[PDB]
Design a protein around this nucleic acid. Structure first.
Ligand SMILES: Cc1cn([C@H]2C[C@H](O)[C@@H](COP(=O)(O)OP(=O)(O)NP(=O)(O)O)O2)c(=O)[nH]c1=O
Ligand SMILES: [Mg+2]
Ligand SMILES: [Mg+2]
Length: 342
DNA sequence: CTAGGGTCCTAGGACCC
DNA sequence: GGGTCCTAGGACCC
């Protein structure tokens, strides 16, 4: 009853696209990210930049201190999206069981594929090659009997590599695996687990399910399952986007509502333009706003509303501004929309 | 010195029976 | 007394 799941993952996806499109960035540390003055962070970076410690989600200010010759690129999301469409169409040549997770990665369920004599190892390789031959970018891949093990495996031979985990290899692979490597166990959860003596899946295997359920809820059940290789989630392939949001972080904290409203006026056309791509009639389920203050607390207020409407967003923003801001500076304003169900 | 695009889970009160 | 919706917040992913 064992299935074959491939996880494909582009190498330094945005950076790799920028070097293809301008070879001059090939051997210099580059990074896609807002400038220091724009208070931005690194989206991604190439390997000459991560040699210096540059990571995704790092404040640009901290990147430039580690890597003073970093080259900041603004990013060209149409170029990234075109490559994403291309790779996904490459996936289609092999199976329709494709669940994309972002521009640059997808799960594939190749169980009932008889490409490459049903070898998932050689299907994964034949996709990386091909991506290489047709897009001049590289991908890493992971092959395992379940989703999360396949995702972990795609980082172990990154860049331009892959890694296979057979069911017979699963128990030994699990035994020393830090919990934080499990997709969905982040920093906060890992630090709680660590603080009661749980670091690896082998640790959680010595744990009672009931206790984990009491301490963590459904997350505790997830944690006990994954700790044993149990991950029965199917590769979906028909997930649909449920929301679209637009938010902006100013270079300077705003302190006056005239500043906020002017920002909303620039945000709204963008949100409308993007909603129309997926809902021409702008018919929606809910709309709302987001403010992030200078103490980094953030708040949203949204409500049932039937159609993208600028004035109600301005209205509810003004309300949020007055009712919850306490004279703090505001670093970010965002608009939001929850899409209708079908 | 802390982005912007998202997803999913939780939790109290409203509302319903 | 038990479901289901509404909203806010937050952990987490890319
Ligand atoms: C994690 C992350 C990613 N991104 C963008 C930029 C990345 O190029 C793209 C793919 O995300 P990955 O996690 O796959 O990292 P990567 O750049 O492709 N490097 P890697 O996959 O080789 O580790 O998605 C961001 O903008 N912010 C992020 O935090
Ligand atoms: Mg990647
Ligand atoms: Mg990825």
């Amino acid at each position: 009853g064992s299935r074959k799941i491939i996880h494909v993952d582009m190498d330094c996806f945005f950076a790799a696209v920028e070097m293809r499109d301008n070879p001059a960035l090939r051997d210099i540390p580059i990074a896609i990210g807002g400038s220091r003055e724009r208070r931005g962070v690194i989206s991604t970076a190439n390997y000459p930049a991560r040699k210096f410690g540059v990571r995704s989600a790092m404040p640009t200010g901290m990147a430039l201190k580690l890597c003073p010759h970093l080259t900041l690129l603004p990013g060209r999301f149409d170029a990234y999206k075109e490559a994403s469409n291309h790779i996904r169409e490459i996936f289609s040549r092999y199976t329709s069981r494709i669940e994309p997770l972002s521009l640059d990665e997808a799960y594939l369920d190749v169980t009932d594929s008889v490409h490459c004599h049903g070898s998932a190892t050689l299907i994964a390789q034949e996709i990386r090659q091909t991506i290489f031959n047709e897009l001049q970018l590289t991908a890493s891949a992971g092959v395992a009997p379940v989703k999360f093990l396949a995702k972990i495996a795609s980082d172990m031979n990154k860049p331009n590599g892959q890694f296979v985990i057979t069911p017979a290899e699963v128990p030994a692979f699990l035994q020393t695996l830090p919990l934080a490597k499990i997709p969905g166990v982040g920093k906060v959860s890992a630090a709680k687990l660590e603080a009661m003596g749980l670091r690896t899946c082998g640790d959680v295997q010595k744990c009672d399910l009931v206790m984990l359920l009491k301490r963590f809820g459904k997350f505790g059940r997830i944690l006990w399952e994954r700790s044993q290789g149990i991950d029965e989630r199917d590769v979906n392939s028909e997930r649909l986007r449920k929301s679209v949001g637009v938010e902006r972080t100013m270079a300077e904290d705003i302190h006056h509502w005239s500043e906020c409203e002017a920002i909303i006026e620039r945000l709204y056309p963008e949100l409308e333009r993007r909603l129309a791509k997926v809902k021409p009639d702008l018919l929606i389920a809910r709309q709302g706003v987001k403010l992030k203050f200078d103490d980094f607390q953030q708040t949203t207020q949204e409500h049932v509303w039937p159609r993208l409407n600028k004035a109600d967003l301005i209205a509810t923003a003004r309300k949020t501004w007055d009712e919850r801001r306490g004279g703090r500076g505001v670093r970010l304003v965002g608009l939001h929309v929850t899409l209708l169900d079908p």
